[PDB]
Design a protein around this ligand. Structure first.
Ligand SMILES: Cc1ncc(C[n+]2csc(CCOP(=O)(O)OP(=O)(O)O)c2C)c(N)n1
Length: 386
């Protein structure tokens, strides 16, 4: 129980994120084995992920609290396995949409893991465990991407073989999830407790942070590969180093000692202001001998956000005097994606304000600046109301 509760939980998080084939799904689909064209992949596969993620996220946070966070973690493991089973056995676009549907389920089930670590350990160690699990999750993402590239670049093994390596690892993650300790109108009660909990000032500040800052962070991270492509060993190294830096900063967030009643709004504003300038750095820089600076801007931006996520998870869980840690996590992830979709519609899509990728980032930079000013203002009014 001593070693089991914390070390094994981080070990599961580290090994659940081991996916050599996750970053090479599209090239594997667009390959000699499966013989799929770009139009089928772009128009029939990727949109299914977007729609199914929203339709699966809504039930996932309602059920993970009641069914406890073990079956959903076990469901996440099984759902991931069926994704690669359909990848290695699929022949038509129908199989690919089903595996994209299963893939969307898996991304909806990561809120269960984040809340699971909070139900396992006493509230005293909420901050340290939050830093540990996020560090373990990001260390898994980093070592999955690096081992994924190494097997394909310095290694000569085919995509099908590389996907087999993921399948064996993913089965191991399923086995690991099978030994996780399960902690010991209904809809009206949880919604009523949702409103009562949101009345607290600490959770409300961080929940609003989750909705908006994560939407901006995901917008930057999602519209970053295209931005570099619009301008192949270097666009991964930034991704690999960004996840590594996020792991270190998330690990360091479980050891920071800050009085989370007076310097909470200021810390959010300081990080958001840093991200606002950093995103602007990624945008307004186009010199050929300046791409290294752009990657340097990206890694710290990823680290700055991933530094505050364990803090946000720790504060929300500590401010929730109920077993509703997952429901708030799901609601914030629900609204963050909705806000992310809304900004994409206005800033990127033609029916709204059509801009090229360069113009989008400066729009995202001012979006962060508005967010930073709001938190800076929010801290000042809280400060004058000492
Ligand atoms: C067809 C297809 N299915 C799945 C993927 C993988 N995928 C789609 S959305 C997504 C999440 C975006 O990752 P990111 O924002 O970098 O994650 P984080 O750093 O927050 O863990 C991933 C991994 C893909 N590229 N293509």
């Amino acid at each position: 129980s001593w070693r089991h509760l914390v070390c094994y939980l981080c070990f599961y998080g580290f090994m659940a994120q081991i996916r050599p084939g996750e970053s090479f799904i599209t090239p594997y689909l667009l390959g000699p084995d499966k013989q799929f064209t770009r139009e089928q992949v772009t128009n029939e596969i990727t949109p299914v992920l977007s729609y199914s993620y929203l339709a699966v996220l809504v039930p996932v946070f309602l059920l993970t609290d009641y069914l406890r966070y073990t079956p959903v973690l076990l469901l996440q493991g099984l759902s991931f396995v069926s994704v690669w089973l359909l990848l290695l056995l699929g022949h038509s676009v129908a199989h690919m949409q089903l595996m994209e549907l299963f893939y969307s389920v898996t991304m909806a089930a990561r809120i269960a893991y984040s809340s699971y670590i909070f139900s396992l350990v006493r509230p005293a160690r909420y901050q340290r465990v939050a830093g540990y699990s996020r560090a373990a999750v990001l260390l898994g993402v980093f070592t999955s991407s690096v081992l994924g590239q190494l097997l394909v670049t310095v290694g000569r093994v085919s995509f099908s073989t590389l996907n087999y390596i993921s399948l064996a690892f993913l089965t191991f993650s399923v086995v690991l999830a099978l030994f996780l300790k399960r902690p010991k109108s209904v809809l009206a009660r949880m919604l009523r407790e949702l409103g009562d909990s949101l009345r607290r000032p600490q959770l409300r500040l961080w929940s609003l942070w989750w909705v908006f800052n994560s939407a901006g962070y995901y917008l930057v991270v999602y519209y970053v590969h295209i931005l570099w492509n619009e301008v192949r060993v270097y666009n991964f190294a930034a991704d690999a180093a960004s996840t590594l830096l996020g792991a270190i900063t998330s690990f360091a967030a479980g050891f920071v000692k800050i009085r989370w009643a007076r310097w909470s709004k200021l810390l959010i504003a300081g990080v958001t202001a840093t991200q606002a300038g950093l995103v602007f750095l990624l945008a307004h820089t186009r010199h050929p001998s300046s791409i290294w600076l752009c990657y340097a801007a990206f890694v710290l931006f990823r680290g700055s956000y991933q530094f505050l996520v364990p803090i946000a998870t720790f504060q929300i869980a500590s401010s929730l005097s109920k077993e509703l840690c997952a429901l708030v996590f799901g609601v914030n992830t629900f609204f963050a994606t909705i806000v992310k979709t809304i900004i994409t519609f206005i800033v990127s899509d033609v029916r709204g304000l059509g801009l090229p990728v360069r113009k989008q980032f400066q729009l995202y930079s001012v979006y962060f600046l508005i967010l930073s000013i709001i938190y800076f203002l929010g801290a000042m009014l809280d400060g004058l109301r000492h």
